[PDB]
Amino acid sequence: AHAFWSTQPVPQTEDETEKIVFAGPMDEPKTVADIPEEPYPIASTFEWWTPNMEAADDIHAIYELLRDNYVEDDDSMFRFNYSEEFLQWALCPPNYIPDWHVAVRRKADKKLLAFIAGVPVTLRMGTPKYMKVKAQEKGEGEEAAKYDEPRHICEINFLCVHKQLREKRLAPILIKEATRRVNRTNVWQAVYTAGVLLPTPYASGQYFHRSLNPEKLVEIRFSGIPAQYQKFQNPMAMLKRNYQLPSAPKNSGLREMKPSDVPQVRRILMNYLDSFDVGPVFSDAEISHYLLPRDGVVFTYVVENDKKVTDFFSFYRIPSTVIGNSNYNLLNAAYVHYYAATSIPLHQLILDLLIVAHSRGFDVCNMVEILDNRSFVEQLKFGAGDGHLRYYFYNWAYPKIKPSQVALVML
């Protein structure tokens, strides 16, 4: 069934995943000295390449590979078109390791044929609360809490093989070479997400989308006057009416985040993230990097009253190519990123996200049902999508958890 994945330290079936009681490594412990020092062998016509993520030309190359060959939805209606500025932001967070960015190029002409990227993340990934309960009833609290300390691991994203090289087993070679480069730095776990089902997710959630420009969503038959709008006299006026938003935020105290807000945002986010079973831990430098506004990339607002930040939200932008549509070639989507509410209902905070996003020209707001995202779906008129996002670890046994116990947003 899986000539590659059966060779790897991941849970091999749902059954296995249902038996797992404690968090911990799957593989034999290893040391850096046991890992090969030489890159994995590859065909003599290809060569490994470590792009320089501060070289414009190198980020452009990666940009073009992904524009034309990265992920499409199962109906090939969309392909992501991550921008060069977004790639620089996602690939170069504080303390990133340039060697974790792995590419294959054709030797002859230096054509980029494949890519995978790893970045550091500090993750809480100890045993979940409801497994730790069952572990007091067993006498077993010490083994259940053994890996509670946040761990410095790798987050994998942007795996891409050029369409002309598909189904030639190049993706396993990429994964093996990234694993080697991460293990050479004494890191032995990774976290990653995918739309597809692989062996074997520890959590899975549906996507949700909120229409902000229903006219456009129609012209690119994603909405297409959704079937339920037919019996209306006037399907489009009703559609716009339903999804209309205010012009300006409703919360007194909302403004863009600025650098002097970083400590307060760190505190309120870390307090909120703590409640979930799997979630990141951010330094002030990581909060600065992932939440300070960057044009075209990430947008973050705080509610400040009486000079205290009490709430905030963020969203980031990923445009998609609209496949087979030259009238409307691009979808401008906003994705809910981290947030924390202490003074207002979450629905009132995220209503202001939608207002801001609409004001700034976004066509749709998307999210996975992680964090407390289900608490505002109905009131804010999100609809469940096609598609899911599945969360995975490499070399980490972990019980199945609901997506509302996951606090890691994956770009």
Ligand X SMILES: CCOC(=O)c1cnc2ccc(OCc3ccc(N4CCNCC4)nc3)cc2c1SCCC#N
Q: What residues are designated binding site?
A: 2-5, 159, 161, 165-167, 169-171, 193
Closest CB to Mg ion among residues 168, 250: 168
Number of residues that bind Mg ion (CB under 5 A): 3
x/- letters, 342..381, toward ligand MYA (CB under 6 A): ----------------------------------------
- Smallest gap, in angstroms, from Cβ of residue 58 to Mg ion? 22
Q: How many residues bind ligand X (CB under 6 A)?
A: 21
Q: Do residues 312 and 301 make contact, with C-beta atoms less than 8 angstroms apart?
A: yes
Is the distance from CB of 299 to CB of 306 less than 8 angstroms? no
Which of the ranges 130-138, 183-191, 311-319, 376-384 carries the binding residues for ligand MYA, by CB under 6 A?
183-191
8 or 329: whose CB is closer to ligand MYA? 8
Q: Say how far apart CA 361 and CA 334 lie, in whole Å.
A: 10
Listed in order, strand segments (DSSP E) in 54-194 are: 78-80, 101-106, 112-124, 151-161, 190-194
Residue numbers after which the chain is interrupted (C to N above 2.5 A) read: none
Residues 161-180, interacting with ligand MYA (CB under 6 A)? 161, 166-172, 175, 178-179
Which residues in 164-183 contact Mg ion (CB under 5 A)? Answer: 168, 170
Q: How many CA atoms lie within 13 A of 83 on its CB side?
A: 16
Does the protein bind Mg ion through residue 43 (CB under 5 A)?
no
Question: How is residue 296 written in tokens?
Answer: 């075209």
Which of 47, 58, 73, 85 contacts ligand X by CB under 6 A?
Answer: 73
- Closer to Mg ion by CB, 104 or 153: give it: 104
What Cα–Cα distance (Å) separates residue 10 from each residue in 4, 142, 144?
Answer: 11, 24, 19
Near ligand MYA in 37-76, by CB under 6 A:
69-71
Characterize the bridge pairing of strands 101-106 and 46-49.
Answer: antiparallel
**Residues whose CB is less than 8 angstroms from the CB of residue 94 and which lie 6 or more positions away in sequence, other chains included:** 283, 285, 286, 289
Residue nearest to ligand X (CB): 195
Is 4 a binding residue for ligand MYA by CB under 6 A? The answer is yes
Residue from the set 132, 209, 266, 358 that interacts with ligand X by CB under 6 A: 209
**Binding flag, residue 89, ligand X (CB under 6 A):** no
CB 303 within 8 A of CB 349: yes
Record the tokens describing residue 173, joined without a space: 């070679």
Tell me which H or E stretch contains 314: strand 308-322
Active site residue 411: yes
Which among ligand X, Mg ion, ligand MYA, none contacts residue 301 (Cβ within 5 to 8 A by kind)?
none
Which partner, Mg ion, ligand MYA, ligand X, none, binds residue 156 by CB below 5 to 8 Å per kind? ligand MYA
Phi, psi of 67 (to 5 degrees): -50, -45
The residue whose two tokens read 């004001």 is 359
Size of the site for ligand MYA (CB under 6 A): 36
Taking CB under 6 A as the rule, does residue 80 contact ligand X?
yes
**Shortest Å, Cβ 38 to ligand MYA:** 18
Q: How many CB atoms lie within 10 A of CB 385?
A: 18
**Which residues lie closer than 8 Å to 392 by C-beta, 6 or more apart?**
10, 191, 192, 193, 194, 198, 200, 201, 202
- What is the binding site for ligand MYA (CB under 6 A)? 2-5, 69-71, 154, 156-161, 166-172, 175, 178-179, 182-183, 187-190, 192, 194, 196, 198, 394-395
Residues designated catalytic: 411
- What is the binding site for ligand X (CB under 6 A)? 71-73, 78, 80, 157, 193-195, 207, 209, 222, 320, 331, 333, 364, 366, 385, 387, 389, 410
